[PDB]
């Protein structure tokens, strides 16, 4: 089958662990509601098998910095 | 100086990873040409670090306002008006998050089995392209003696469509069960089963001619172009989900003009990337140089909540937490009354509300805090 | 540690405001200059007493 | 009152059978009065 992550427009998506999520929240001094949101019906979310309440680490292909890290919180539809 | 020493110095230097690789490659290229010494390499690395530190943006900069100005100013010299209609209408449609863009265009790529020869590309295109009965027919004539509509088609368009006559009559007979279809020569003859009223003939004649014989819905025109010793298929209309699962089509590089289809099929991050690419392509076509950082900031603000949002009263401004900022932009009475109903509280953390009241804005010098020891003497 | 343009502007404005309503100049200045010019000269001499509080 | 060419006449007949609900002028006047002035007596709607 055609994986959703093989597209050039789709960056790598990885589910953060609990300790990784806590460290990310501590680093930026933000709550879980101050992160960008991603819908639970997103193709990347259903491909990763994530559930609402998790934080997805996105490895963007930066035109300026080469590789850039973005974080999105899974929320219900 | 060996390459290992240069790599070690580059790694020891404080630089981003993308800068480190480019600097190492340039130093390797220049090392054989001019026989660089260790002190020269160290000075080059120090200068690169200093330039990187100098290029860092200072805190407190109004990046959003600068981005909005740097996007809106080149639009004042844009040009208005195959069938791609770029320019100011295109960027307006992009920033307004239009559900259905005007003249959608789908860029379709092919795998290794079809990207080398024109015949495979042509048959893939004819598989993608949607052909119905009304375009195949030469003229329309309602016949009353048989009490049913009669269809005739030219041989050239039937041959180029890729399906023969038997395929056509099997397509309509399976799809439509109210009336039967008979064919002789190069003509279609339709015969009713329980149709007697003349008014019921028109409702069944139009349904027959608009039925799609083959291809994907929403695609009516398809062209093929060659670039970089590869064949790229450009279609009119957008059906991303259907065209993704089509044999002979590479789904890794296939993209569409509709950002909403990209979000629904690929993801929100892919939608943001598509928005950035569309804005960059429009600016490049118009001949206007705009820094990509403004475009990525706009796209990040557009896809903050996981869905594509416009920049108007129904998008980013509509979901602003400030009552005064929302009321000041487009809709004043409705927003104020809605805030009065809910008892909303405006924390005055934004810029517009502080401008309205007469308080310093939280940008530039407004975020600077000062302290001073009192026992100060000359 | 280097001053940003916004921080430098805020420091110069605060010093000029202080000079306008008192706060005698800590360095010798030519006669007939504005308080803003005196604050700029003080900043050039590196004698400003105003610091910047940064988040931590 | 429209034309005599059979192509126009076919569309005319189609319109006539599609609009066979109204038989006389009074019913069409009732429709016009209902659209212009809904919720009014029949005489007032007819006059309007």
UniProtKB/Swiss-Prot annotation, chain A:
Matches recorded under PROSITE patterns: RNA_POL_H_23KD (PS01110)
Alphabetic keyword roster: Cytoplasm, DNA-directed RNA polymerase, Nucleotidyltransferase, Transcription, Transferase
UniProt keyword annotation of Cytoplasm present: yes
Main location: cytoplasm
Pfam families attached to this UniProt entry: RNA_pol_Rpb5_C
Subunit structure: Part of the RNA polymerase complex.
Name the UniProt record assigns to this protein: DNA-directed RNA polymerase subunit Rpo5
Source organism (scientific name): Thermococcus kodakarensis (strain ATCC BAA-918 / JCM 12380 / KOD1)
UniProtKB/Swiss-Prot annotation, chain B:
Superkingdom, natural source: Archaea
A Pfam family per the record: RNA_pol_Rpb1_5
CDD domains: RNAP_A
Gene Ontology MF terms: DNA binding; DNA-directed RNA polymerase activity
Main location: cytoplasm
Transmembrane segments: none
Localization per Swiss-Prot or TrEMBL: Cytoplasm; Chromosome
Keywords: Chromosome, Cytoplasm, DNA-binding, DNA-directed RNA polymerase, Nucleotidyltransferase, Transcription, Transferase
Entry EC no(s): 2.7.7.6
Reactions it catalyzes: RNA(n) + a ribonucleoside 5'-triphosphate = RNA(n+1) + diphosphate
A single cellular component GO annotation: cytoplasm
GO BP annotations, alphabetical order: DNA-templated transcription
Classification via SUPFAM superfamilies: beta and beta-prime subunits of DNA dependent RNA-polymerase
InterPro entries per the UniProt record, alphabetical: DNA-dir_RpoC_beta_prime, RNA_pol_Rpb1_5, RPO1C
General function of this protein: DNA-dependent RNA polymerase (RNAP) catalyzes the transcription of DNA into RNA using the four ribonucleoside triphosphates as substrates. Forms part of the jaw domain.
PANTHER family, per the entry: DNA-DIRECTED RNA POLYMERASE, DNA-DIRECTED RNA POLYMERASE III SUBUNIT RPC1
Complex formation: Part of the RNA polymerase complex.
Homology family: Belongs to the RNA polymerase beta' chain family.
NCBIfam families on file: RNA_pol_rpoA2
The protein, known as: DNA-directed RNA polymerase subunit Rpo1C
Organism: Thermococcus kodakarensis (strain ATCC BAA-918 / JCM 12380 / KOD1) (Pyrococcus kodakaraensis (strain KOD1))
Gene name of the record: rpo1C
